[PDB]
């Protein structure tokens, strides 16, 4: 991203844009199923939904890193997010507590390596020092990966 809003620099510029140097972000807009007020609901095209499915694609793309195989998409949380109740951060939380995420990034690796890699995926930045590290590792020692 832009240099000037380094988090060490501007603790007042954390919710800013990523600019054009950073990767492109995804906001869930135009939630499908809200089609006006007046009675209708018999359309075909409904251009909003084709743009909402791509947010669901990018969520797998950033938490898992790749696209998931066809037999392992989480269809329940997919249609629950499309319905309108579960939100994007709720979908990321329910995705990172799946069995595939556990058997890919918690089961084959060391505890501290898996904690650091989960910080690379979810928060999107490496952990600063030890101040975060047997903090999240102290949390891992009482309730586990879910905590």
């Amino acid at each position: 991203g832009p240099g000037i809003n380094n988090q060490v620099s501007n603790p007042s510029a954390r919710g800013l844009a990523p600019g054009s140097l950073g990767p492109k972000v995804f906001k869930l807009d135009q939630l499908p199923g809200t089609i006006g007020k007046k009675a209708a609901k018999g359309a075909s095209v409904k251009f909003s939904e084709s743009s909402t499915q791509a947010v669901i694609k990018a969520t797998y793309l950033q938490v898992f890193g790749r696209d998931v195989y066809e037999g392992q998409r989480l269809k329940v949380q997919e249609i629950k997010l499309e319905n309108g109740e579960i939100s994007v951060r709720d979908f990321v939380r329910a995705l990172a507590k799946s069995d595939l995420f556990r058997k890919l990034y918690w089961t084959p690796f060391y505890v501290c390596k898996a904690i650091e890699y989960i910080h690379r995926r979810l928060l999107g930045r490496p952990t600063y020092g030890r101040q975060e590290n047997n903090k999240y590792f102290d949390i891992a020692s009482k309730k586990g990966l879910y905590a």
Partner: protein, 160 residues
Amino acid sequence: QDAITAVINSADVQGKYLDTAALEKLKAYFSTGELRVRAATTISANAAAIVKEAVAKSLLYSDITRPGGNMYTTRRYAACIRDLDYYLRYATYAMLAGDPSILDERVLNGLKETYNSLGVPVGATVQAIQAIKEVTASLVGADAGKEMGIYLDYISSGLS
């Protein structure tokens, strides 16, 4: 949704193809689309001046901009400017689509509950949108002005 995609969706619910009635609707949409493009340019020219003239005509020197009003605070005044800037921009989008359903789905989904919960007055917003309608009708022209005013009045009726 455009006017084109609305025509296609209506024919698709019927299950038939695009014969002469739908084709004549599409020819009508193309003929108005030329002046719609020209109006989009002349609206994107001076959107800031349009919002400035609208708030100077309607909202300034009243009780809501005085201490004890909804537009007193500096962040509240900036939110007012950005909301009127939105109404102009989305009325431009709904003008170019020739179809107000994208405008409805975009802002009239939740702006009623948002202005309910925040305590924002509705009628002052309706007056401000009407002032935007007068300023854009004076700036652009007659028929493109009323084409803009159709969707601006759609916004003002959706908020009420």
